[PDB]
Symmetry: C5
Subunit: 311 residues, 5 copies
């Protein structure tokens, strides 16, 4: 078993296809996803040609060991795919039709900038390394690229699964490599975040703003310090569900900005008390009255500016 | 070893059966469950036929390699099942009786809408891909479909395990596929949720309502802010045990609604203090007296409306 | 290699023995434990018999493939045991002495009702499926059932390891199955729970009761609300270490009941303040004085009633 | 391939050696550690003897299958070691020199009594089961026992890796076994615990003692209840990093004792307020003045007594 | 298959190269990283030489079994690498060109002293053990050492991947070993830590300092005790993301020092109250006024001293 010889000097074309069966375990922190799919391969090996008159069968079936099979790998995998060959069917001209079902943990990076209103392009890169005897090139058989309707990725919407038909042919360590880009387009189901994180977080912030209708320093301290603690709890929760990015994320920006609002409300509460104690409640009263409008107005504008910057 | 040839042009019928031994590790977040079961297969291979009078033996035992065995797979699995053949028995007419014991991690989605008073239909999809020589169709031998009494799924009640007898026959990548639906019906043991989550949560909410029988702003602030923190703790706990759904769950809606009750009680406590300070405790007194009834009444009605919507 | 033929019509008896080497990873939430043990098997194969005189040897050693070995499995396992054959020794009368060392993750359910003062009977079910040629029955060789002194299960006391000598014969999928019950008796090391959970929990409850020697509503609110929060922390901690049971556990009952004590102390604290403000401190004083005795007395009695119900 | 025959009736001596390459993943809760080491074996097989004069060769290299190799196992492992043979070299006298590199997860119990100032003796027990033909005894070749400089166990200091040269020979299931004790001596790097757990815990306790210089019941309640909550947080953190022991640990004793100090300070704070309200601030003042000395003095003595008991 | 014989007495040179494909799962606590790379090996086997004229081919492809291949291992791995041979090619002179794609979990220690502004040198140690027949020495083919552009390590910047060209040859168990150091230089993406941990932590500390503009003991106690609790929350979060080091880390030291600031502010708040109650608010006033400057000034200087010591 060695590669099929060329009729001229042409490279050997391996037609490929990936059909997704199961898509699961999309880890945001790890920037990985698990995939269970069909991998279909097709090439001509004239040495396998037969007469069905003589052989008695129109199509021959071979075991992987019996014939030459191209060493196909995935670029962006943790470990080599766990594959089980489904069928190897040889037609009288020497055309080999290979099918396997595999499972792999794919490493494809994610862009969390718009999180949790973000979309991703997951990649599955198919590769073949050319042999000394002859050069191997990958092709996309669009008829054999797809996914079933059952394919469900928890907390995501699956938009598309397509292949970039033109392979990336390049030199690596004195040999040729033919790379294929299978792109799985997905968009996050942002719903859950609103009642689970966003609105709870806004409610505690608004609770802190009731200190602007209070003259009790002891109560105001309790209000603004306690809501701040509840915010720290949400911040920790959020940062446990996300990786450490070298950029700011949308949720991250909002969460951070709210700390500034808590900080300024502590300043306001302090200023109001100091003046009241210094026997000038008229100044304290005018600051507190301004705060009642300024805090929500600045909050609303800051958020518009933020949303504008991110989307 | 190749598929048994057809007498006419009829497809080859593979009679199937799944007998559950162990059912375990139902992960709600992952929407997966682990299974340890018997898989029984049966088909007629006329080439394996023999005379019961001439052979002496009425049954012959073969090793997997010795005979043709259909390539049977599960659709909704993480990885291919870990199988170990128990027995292969051939009758004189050439009817093969295959038995294996397997273990697999099954991906079957869950409906959390009524959580924790929800029921699920777990699926195990058996599939066969037809060969070039002849078409393979799956069948259900009801006599070989079951589960043992010992089958225990922690925190669940196992209702039924049945097969949808009519296979889903369809074309995939120019070959026929025969799919079978094995449905495992289960209902959640909601008991634990009442003393662990529901009642603790209601007790803290009721503790917050004691502020309606208090004139002390500083104490009321402490009461409503502290119970709010305790509620956040239960909300986080609950959302760690569940996946992020693009819909509202029952527990989710109740938890969210209680935030609104905390928010309004903070408004009430603030309003009562402001009036008292504005030297109008008569208005404050009538609002607080109304709150005493309104808060429980609106809580009880909102909950009835919620339960009606979910059930 | 086929089963040994019967002299009459008697079933083939396979004498068994499990000798525990390592017992570890008892997961309460998963209701699983890991095991590492010797499995010893013994049966008569007349076909393997020899004369020690002409042969020169009194014992013959064979490789697993060379002779017929019964397909022995465990019922309550996650996946099939990882086994390594240690020795296969044949005596002149054809008596085969098999030994393997295996490791398996066993699913055996637990009764948490008396937790953490509970005891369990872990099970390891050995099974053999009868063949068409002849029926296979299991037996217990008590001389080969045991465990070493080193066998340590973290946080548990190992009481016994015995086998239910009479196998349970039954039909499963038109074949006879011979099942053996190996019972590993263990009792929980409840020590840790006292300084880690029980006493911390009682101390915070007793701290809440100091409000019965205080006339300060603001301080009482702080006391009872804060200790309640600390109780919620212990409740969550406990429920993370345990599975969700469709019944009440001992610790669960105690933990739940303490919620009610906190609720009533909030009512008492509220009632005392209201009366004091309504200018009737004499009534408030008599209620508070009663509470000082009633709270500990009712607590002590409720606990006696609880302990009585559970033990 | 069968065992080498004895010249007399002497047992076969297998000289052993373990050379640690990697020591990692010491799990305190699991009482396990992972290892990566060389296992060296040596025994005389007279059947493999040759003439170095005629053979021209001083050494002959064989593949594992070609020669008899003793079945060596580890007692205290989770699963059987993952091994890969490095070399098999035979000398003219028939002395076999075996070398493999293995990796195993070892179960060796730990003594937490002095935690985190504790030391441990990890064990690796090598074992051989004697065959019917002849008895096998293990030996230690001290020249082939060691570890490299690079061997780093995170948060531990590696003291010594030695073997107990005299094997423990005993009968198990009618056959002889020869056991060897490889002891890995390690001591915990206690540094981290001081700024991470111990000092934070002492600082909160000392903050609670500032209530002895305060007449404000409301403030004292806040001080002692809040520091108590922060102490519960450290207790939970500590008990998550440790297994549940049927004995008291050093850190556990200290952590438990500090609860009693918090409990008594709540009593003191309560007593001081009650007296002040009962219009006897002179008694309250003398109790508070005593508390200022008594609390630190009793704390310091209790700790000396504790440290004395544990070390 | 035995090692190629030496022309003189020279050692056999194995030219090596590692080309990184995937770099992932850098665990700080475990001090491990996962790698997926090409391993290229090259050595002269004169026995494998041929005439390209006679044979007609200028390259010869062999299967691993067909020829002698050096037993190459990694020193700092958990378990032996999962490898799959890509190609084996022989040139007329007998120069073998081996290529495999492997995946391994590498244990390489990290220096947390400057965390999270730290840089690391990850190591991959290639090793070969000399045989009895001849000595094997490793070499670096710089032409075959590299990494692709796609190589992304989450939360890290990949600086370089180079090999220390001169092997560290040494004796281990009377045999020579040739070791190669492949160094992967990386620097931490410290960005995230600033909005996530550093600034939240500074904001709560600054909130505590508002007590220096307050005469209310009850409010000051609430402020400094609450912010202390929020600080403990960040400390625990940080220490969960890091291993226990026998040295102080940068973040660790800052976090520790902030406890001292909280402790002294509690002393200040206590002192101010005591004096006020002792009817000397003039002394209390001058201490509080000094604190307003002293706390930020000492904080800023202590941090300069710290940063100076660490960088
Ligand atoms: C406090 C801040 C609350 C966050 C507000 C939502 C952010 C947003 O406006 O998110 C926007 C995304 C949709 O993004 P897209 O249209 O696909 O992006 C492409 C946009 N271009 C082409 C213009 C660049 O969701 C929505 O439809 C909004 C629904 C969520 C409302 C939650 C409110 C509570
Ligand atoms: C005399 C007062 C009796 C109090 C009984 C409280 C009933 C609680 C029933 C809980 C059912 C589960 C809903 C709970 C609201 C808080 C009750 C506050 C009572 C304040 C008393 C004021 C002085 C007259
Ligand atoms: C009589 C006034 C009714 C007040 C109702 C307030 C509803 C606010 C709705 C917010 C929805 C988001 C928004 C933030 C508002 C801060 C809380 C309002 C305090 C009002 C106290 C008034 C004392 C006289
Ligand atoms: C505040 C929270 C209040 C508790 C919510 C109770 C939810 C509920 O009432 O849940 C209802 C469940 C759902 O089960 P179902 O019978 O199949 O309903 C479907 C009915 N259809 C087919 C007609 C639409 O009924 C139970 O088993 C009752 C459990 C009672 C637990 C009460 C705990 C207190
Ligand atoms: C004179 C006061 C003696 C202090 C005794 C403390 C008893 C603790 C017993 C522990 C039992 C376990 C049992 C919880 C009750 C809290 C004690 C309240 C303090 C009373 C202040 C009285 C002011 C005159
Ligand atoms: C609130 C405080 C909770 C105290 C719980 C005590 C548990 C108990 O009372 O009993 C737990 C077990 C009972 O085990 P058993 O022998 O099976 O009892 C059934 C026997 N009959 C059938 C004969 C009646 O005994 C023990 O370990 C007692 C020591 C634990 C004391 C811990 C005190 C704190
Ligand atoms: C809160 C109170 C915290 C007390 C912590 C000190 C514990 C102690 O005293 O620990 C003692 C350990 C003992 O370790 P050993 O020398 O191996 O035992 C040998 C014992 N013989 C002679 C009985 C065999 O000494 C150390 O190295 C710890 C020194 C660091 C002190 C950290 C202080 C904070
Ligand atoms: C008029 C006072 C404005 C004070 C603004 C505070 C500076 C904020 C700098 C933010 C840095 C990020 C150093 C933190 C302490 C802040 C305390 C301020 C108390 C204000 C009371 C003034 C009474 C007249
Ligand atoms: C002037 C006060 C200096 C601060 C004293 C605390 C130093 C602690 C050093 C611990 C070393 C180990 C140690 C016990 C500390 C109790 C703190 C109470 C301080 C109360 C101030 C009252 C002002 C009238
Ligand atoms: C609390 C205060 C936060 C302290 C943060 C440490 C800053 C620092 O100075 O960090 C130091 C490191 C750089 O160190 P280096 O490049 O490895 O060596 C430098 C070469 N020397 C050793 C010869 C001098 O990064 C920075 O410039 C971090 C910039 C972000 C600052 C954080 C803002 C808040
Ligand atoms: O035969 C299979 O494995 C899968 C079929 C499918 O997803 O339709
Ligand atoms: O023989 C078995 O593997 C299983 C039997 C059972 O579940 O009864
Ligand atoms: O594996 C063995 O030979 C022995 C184990 C034991 O005695 O526990
Ligand atoms: O050859 C090896 O596998 C290891 C060598 C070492 O630790 O020195
Ligand atoms: O052929 C490969 O396995 C890898 C290629 C790559 O990383 O470019
Ligand atoms: Cl392939
Ligand atoms: Cl792959
Ligand atoms: Cl099959
Ligand atoms: Cl499958
Ligand atoms: Cl077996
Ligand atoms: Cl098994
Ligand atoms: Cl071995
Ligand atoms: Cl082993
Ligand atoms: Cl190799
Ligand atoms: Cl390796
Ligand atoms: Cl040397
Ligand atoms: Cl050498
Ligand atoms: Na092939
Ligand atoms: Na077959
Ligand atoms: Na308060
Ligand atoms: Na056999
Ligand atoms: Na061998
Ligand atoms: Na080889």
């Amino acid at each position: 078993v060695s590669p099929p010889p060329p009729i001229a000097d042409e490279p050997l074309t391996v037609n490929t296809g990936i059909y997704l069966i199961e898509c699961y375990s999309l880890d945001d922190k790890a920037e990985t996803f698990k995939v269970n799919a069909f991998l279909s391969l097709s090439w001509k090996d004239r040495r396998l040609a037969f007469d069905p008159v003589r052989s008695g069968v129109r199509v021959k079936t071979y075991e992987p060991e019996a014939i030459w099979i191209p060493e196909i790998r995935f670029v962006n995998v943790e470990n080599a795919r766990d594959a089980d060959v489904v069928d190897i069917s040889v037609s009288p001209d020497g055309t080999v039709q290979y099918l396997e079902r595999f499972s792999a943990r794919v490493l494809s990076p994610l862009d969390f900038r718009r999180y949790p209103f973000d979309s991703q392009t997951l990649h599955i890169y198919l590769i073949v390394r050319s042999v000394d005897t002859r050069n191997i090139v990958l092709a996309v058989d669009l008829e054999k690229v797809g996914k079933n309707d059952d394919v469900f990725l928890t907390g995501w919407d699956i938009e598309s699964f397509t292949a970039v038909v033109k392979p990336a042919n390049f030199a690596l360590e004195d040999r040729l490599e033919s790379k294929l880009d299978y792109q799985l387009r997905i968009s996050r189901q942002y719903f859950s975040y609103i009642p689970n994180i966003i609105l709870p977080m806004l409610f505690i912030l608004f609770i802190s703003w009731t200190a602007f209708w209070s003259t009790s320093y002891e109560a105001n301290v309790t209000l603004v310090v306690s809501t701040l603690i509840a915010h720290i709890a949400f911040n920790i929760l959020v940062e446990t569900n996300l990786p450490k990015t070298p950029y700011m994320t949308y949720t991250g920006a909002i969460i951070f900005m709210i700390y500034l609002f808590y900080f300024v409300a502590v300043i306001e509460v302090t200023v109001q008390h100091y003046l009241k104690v210094e026997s000038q409640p008229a100044r304290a009263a005018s600051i507190t009255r301004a705060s009642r409008i300024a805090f929500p107005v600045v909050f609303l504008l800051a958020n518009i500016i933020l949303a504008f910057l991110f989307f």
